[PDB]
Amino acid sequence: MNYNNKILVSESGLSQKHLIHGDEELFQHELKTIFARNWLFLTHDSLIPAPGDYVTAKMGIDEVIVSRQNDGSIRAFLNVCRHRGKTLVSVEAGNAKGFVCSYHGWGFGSNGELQSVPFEKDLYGESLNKKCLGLKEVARVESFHGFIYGCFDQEAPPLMDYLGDAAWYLEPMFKHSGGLELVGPPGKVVIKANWKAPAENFVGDAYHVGWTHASSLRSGESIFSSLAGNAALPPEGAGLQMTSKYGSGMGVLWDGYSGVHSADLVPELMAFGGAKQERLNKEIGDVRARIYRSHLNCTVFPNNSMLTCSGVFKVWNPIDANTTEVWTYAIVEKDMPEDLKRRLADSVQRTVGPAGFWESDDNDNMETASQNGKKYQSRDSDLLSNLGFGEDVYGDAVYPGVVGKSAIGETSYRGFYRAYQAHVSSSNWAEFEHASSTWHTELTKT
Amino acid sequence: MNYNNKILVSESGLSQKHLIHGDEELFQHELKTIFARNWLFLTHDSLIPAPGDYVTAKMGIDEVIVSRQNDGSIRAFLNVCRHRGKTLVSVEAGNAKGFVCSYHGWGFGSNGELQSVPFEKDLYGESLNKKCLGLKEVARVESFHGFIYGCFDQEAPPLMDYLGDAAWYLEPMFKHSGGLELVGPPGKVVIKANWKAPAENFVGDAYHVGWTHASSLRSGESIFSSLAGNAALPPEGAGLQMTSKYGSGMGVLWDGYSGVHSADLVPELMAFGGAKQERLNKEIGDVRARIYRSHLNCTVFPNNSMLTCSGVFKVWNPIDANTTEVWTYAIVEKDMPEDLKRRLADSVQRTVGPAGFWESDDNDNMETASQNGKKYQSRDSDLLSNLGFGEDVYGDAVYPGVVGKSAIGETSYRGFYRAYQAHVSSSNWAEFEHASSTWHTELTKT
Amino acid sequence: MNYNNKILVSESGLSQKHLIHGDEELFQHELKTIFARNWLFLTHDSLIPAPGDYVTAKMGIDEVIVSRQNDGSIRAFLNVCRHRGKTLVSVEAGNAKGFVCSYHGWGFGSNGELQSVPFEKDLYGESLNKKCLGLKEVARVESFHGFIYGCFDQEAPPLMDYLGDAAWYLEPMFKHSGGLELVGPPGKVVIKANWKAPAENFVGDAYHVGWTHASSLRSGESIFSSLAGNAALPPEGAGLQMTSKYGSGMGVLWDGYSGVHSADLVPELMAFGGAKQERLNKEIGDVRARIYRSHLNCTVFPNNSMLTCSGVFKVWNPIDANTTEVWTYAIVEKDMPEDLKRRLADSVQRTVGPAGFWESDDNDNMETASQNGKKYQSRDSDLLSNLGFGEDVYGDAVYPGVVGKSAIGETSYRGFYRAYQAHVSSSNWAEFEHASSTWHTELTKT
Amino acid sequence: INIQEDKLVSAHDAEEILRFFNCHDSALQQEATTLLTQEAHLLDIQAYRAWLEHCVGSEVQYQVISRELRAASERRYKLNEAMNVYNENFQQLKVRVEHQLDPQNWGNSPKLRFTRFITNVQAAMDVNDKELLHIRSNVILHRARRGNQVDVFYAAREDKWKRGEGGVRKLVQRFVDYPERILQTHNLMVFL
Amino acid sequence: INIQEDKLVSAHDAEEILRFFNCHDSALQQEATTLLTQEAHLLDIQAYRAWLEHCVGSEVQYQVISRELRAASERRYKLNEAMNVYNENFQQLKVRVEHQLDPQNWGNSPKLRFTRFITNVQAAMDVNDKELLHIRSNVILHRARRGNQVDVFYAAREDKWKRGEGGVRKLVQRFVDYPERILQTHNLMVFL
């Protein structure tokens, strides 16, 4: 398939060829044009706080070691020995000054450097240039308020610029709240879905909640519970949708601070959020203080998603076109009481973790939509994302980005897939930029 | 591989490259040139008799919903939502006026039309053109005496013409008997064989019966039991073989009305068939009345097979080059006593169903012949189908088609694979027709 | 990928692209350029000693029947029926005058000839040319002191020439010892590694033994036990490494006659080997008598490995790029007492068989190094094999081949991969020869 | 169990629960365990004739069904809900045993390997026929053949056993509703 | 067990062994076997309300953890070792049961099929609370749905059971440390 020419996503992001969820050649092409090029979530400060602390993470299909350095910085390296390519680290987290390979015993520092080679003098003499045999380093590692992302491409925009107009929406919770912590370790489950199915669902899909999660809404008694079975549509002005140049986007459901959490947490959460909002009004203004305690369903392009307030943090790790490894963490506000943090973390897993009753509602939708992408009569068919098209704005005086001033629509799908297509058809960041010079105009047409 | 040029089947169908059973690129090419082009079995009137009755079926690797309309017609649609491509129907059979998608709640009629969209007014206004969002319909749906077939290609011959000279042989049982019913639900089992292995075996393979089924012949005491272990060859003129322009073909074993059924059903069946034959002599003539009560092993090209009289009805549903999903139904004559129908259905499954002791005899033959097609030294080797070549006729005064007037031979392999090669090397029906303008001459050479 | 041009192995064998362990297109290309071209291990005289004795074996992904003929020769044939391609033989060993196909009953002789066809007269008349329907024969079958190898390519060098300079090292044990027997049947286990990972490890990898097998060294109390955990490096002149034109190579660890065997066998083995060495000094000279009782870790290119003295004999049967079927036999000296032979065989399996505690130490190394070859950021990375480069010699007065006069290095990797690259980039043996006309010069550079 | 409240429970399944919750006879559960362990041993070693002779009653019905997938809310569609993978009387089981033992059953060379794991045994005497023993048990059945073929079956078995010739308890009905709709085990040619 | 010598054994695991090696009460093991076979039967037929009513105590903690993979020699890294796949009180289990029974739980049409195999049952009375029964058992849980989806779960269960309403023994704690770190079963939405 010719990725320069093939129209996988139509103008304005209005439709996508269903094959994008099933085609293995395109999956391989995504490893290059999506995953090797863009910012990918690694870990949080709270998981590797002290020097020598490390975790392993996926970046696309590659595995990396992410290590706190002695100077307080974080560096990341391919989890592959520089000798004959054995996997260096077989655990998920720990603390070490370095890593020794179990094949021939080569010893690498936490800083990636080849520090020791067994019997180097006797065997290699002075001839092994260890300076040139450090672990393959992840070119770019940056932090967004403790959330650590990596990028293999040195040419990428800084993470802050990459978040674009999405950053303004995340800041009340990620920054002005006093900071978030990631509670580990994550749940990990393999689903038979393409990574884009859950990514698109989190970025933009409020439409499904009432029908898909009817049973979970009714059973759990959560704040969105009136939606169960499409019994009710959100009020006028119940929220909005946004999207951004580099593909990240989110829904905003005003005031939904208890999110997916069952009635056992609703009163305490609604009190806590309301109390912080009152303090924040003075600091960041009423609109942004309200955003702090409003439910944001967001995808940080390409494959990191979250529900703020619900406290859900997801990585959709790609395996092949119909296989994804789902990592599920909880996010909590640092200044919450410890007992609340613990119950919130349990509630995140309860609802959307490996046995998450909400997440179970989504499984067949994600899996079959992805697998149908392989079926012959569906490959060239069009997935529709036209809801709200021709009502989006850009450059609004209050809410930045390309914005749909309605709670339910497909604005964020359109921006996600506009960015996706611009990457798939480009060889580097310069070409993506050239392909995106009229991004918001394309999205606000008609 | 260049399918216009590559000789996968030699002149007159005398041999086939073994790779045809193993090559995944060719499998993908078959989805286009075989399965998307030809008539495929869906269901029977008896399984969806009343308005709103539906079943799901495979057509190649695609899934369709097959629905009885209010006006008594049958229409079939891809089982894929027109919004974001979720599988619409998750059951095998039922009765409904329509189908609602579990993702966002879009509601489709039994007639495929997009009938409702949740909150359409509030969300889409007047802007969603539902008239253009009906389910993707199977272009062609036709019936052969209650047996319902579909074809994705509008250019296909009518089903009757497509059956060609095979139709004459099926009519005594399918039409003049008073009609057949399909007894469901089917058995369903996955085998590690290419769909062509069982298809070719049913179309033309009487040679294997004595040796492959030696143990089943001896144990069950059926009417063909004297063949066990090649102890005996059928008499002179014990049957014939035929084949046709569009690839369908069959063996005829004179008088074998009890077929594979064990001695517990032989007397009752032989009486019942003989009694109907006596009545039919007057209506359709002695030869065709005899055909009615003779065992026909037939493949309706490409992947539907049956044993008449035994009452076996098979779909070889393709999954990949070495995986097939086998569906097994029973066929019974409508005017049989209900208790006989029930015992006949059980006996079909007993012999050739999921635990069919006969079908078990075939498994290793089908699976290893298919898997050997992947092995390097066998890919370019030739599968032989030359038995009886140079003794076939066309245009006989009594028995139509290309016919071998012998019970055991490979006539029907040759016609099956002639049709297969003509499709694989053609881009459409017109090209198949041009490639088949001397079909019977090619088959009757030397 | 263009195999004529792509540099998969750098000059002098100094590095290999990591993708070679993961790329399925290259795996398919290896079936042609490695496995269909080179000598592959089949069996031993001791396993098919009498006329009619046969075994099945893999040659690449193909299966062959290997049969002792009436005249005492051995012939090998594809295990595929010449009619419709069913697998002829479903067992691993036996004795028969021929093989009958379970599909249609065609009968083939132990000599491959189509000897009988059921009802040939009635069905085929005089028209079936059975003379042309013998099983597809393995072009070349030769013996190295009872060890039987096959090659599909008639153009291959004779097996003796193919072993090149490696033959001199094997002869003391394989010939001058009085002969070896292979003790069957083999263990058989599937590992998730490329066939080259274990092949390279056996050909050349003494470096790993101390670290990888630390736990097995310490627990079993074997003669190499002082190496455990890199506690000690072998003495000065503790051994050597060699390699050869056609890729075979080995390590030599002087005097290690008890090899991997735990202390329960060390005294008896060291006595037995020393006693035979004393007799051999007079016959073949002190150096070669010592080689007889020195531990040789060898790969006969491409995928047959062994540890002499330990008595380990391995076939790394390829399945796909990250799957290998490991066959493990024991080799014993014919003139050993029968009770020792039995305990030695058990000890081989104990250490390196399906539950071999040594072999278990290797699993993750082999599996992850192979699987990392598929990961995007590692495909184009370089596996290093430069240890000892610039210290190898050729044409030494005592030890033939390209030789590193040190116990631990990567000499044998370099010769293995030089041969591999010459085959992968060549269309036939003539081209390999042209690509190898300066093989030893390339290996001894700098 | 009230199946109006426990919405997912079938009338049949509710009836079988009641059978075993009522009375517990520890010795009977132990008799049933022995009977089923011995039956499974005979089958595992492929002593199919011994199985017929020692374990299977002349009046047996040996039935394994496969049920069509239907909507949980389906109330109108009324046609045959299931097919019979097995629905065998003694003579039909005998035909199958003879098929297994036939020296030209090519599929049985090299010899198959069976290993059965029988668990969750419950036993209760019939209310009306004091000589009919209801036994429920679950089976994992492992079948290995031809080097690398491995098939594992999983099922619940509803049996009726009754004392026959020589006072030996023998199987008079086995009923299995096979849990997997599409088999992924090449066939179901095993005696569950 | 000395865990200084048996280097691979956790303090927790060593504590649980001692519990069952001490005293053997054959009748108690038989009571536990019945209790667990009946619980498993109710769950297999999807009688989730009956399960709650007959098997689960009001004070229950139903907990399934997943433990992060750490180096066998790890002594410094100190953060949360595990997450809770389940950590449910009675009300939370009730929410899950209601979710299973909801007619708009689309995932449950067509009806799922469960088959559980309970083995290795051990039972011991608590030393201090003479009314608390410690039961250990292992489960294989087979879940089949939608024609060709088959998921098999494997686990050891550390339970505490206590007599409740009507003198019926009910589950007051279940603890499972799930053995597979990355689930390959689509989810863990089954009651182990």
Place this chain on the structure above:
Amino acid sequence: INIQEDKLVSAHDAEEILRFFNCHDSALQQEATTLLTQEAHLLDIQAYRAWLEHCVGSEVQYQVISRELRAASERRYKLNEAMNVYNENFQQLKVRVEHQLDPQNWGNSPKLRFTRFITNVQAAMDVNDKELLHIRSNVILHRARRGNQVDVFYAAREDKWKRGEGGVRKLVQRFVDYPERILQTHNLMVFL
């Protein structure tokens, strides 16, 4: 069992059936069940030293074979029918236990997870040696490691157990004929 009539049954298998059909000693079956459940618990928690000390006799033969696939009708080919995956005396088992416990056994970090399911227990005293207990049982053994590696083993075990030091019954012979010819579990490095 007449193996001339039951054509598929081996002489060895026929001999073992007779052992258990003869006499049934319910209490002995219960003793065997306890012994095997405790052994399996020690192994599952990786208390390999405790296993050796409490479960394994000094005179043990611990043997697991793999049998070459041969024609059911094969009567001439006479060479070694099987190889020994395990054929261990006490010292050899000790070597393996030490290998498991070694802190440089890199394969054991992160720690493995074992779960064993023991079923179909039968027990009979030897006819000639009144102190030798024959126990037959089947095992499913689940091994999980490194996030997504899962290997499941299936086998029948023919054991001999005898009272040793302190009157404790210990394993003096285990024999397993492994049912799968080509292992699909990376290795057989588990104690069945």
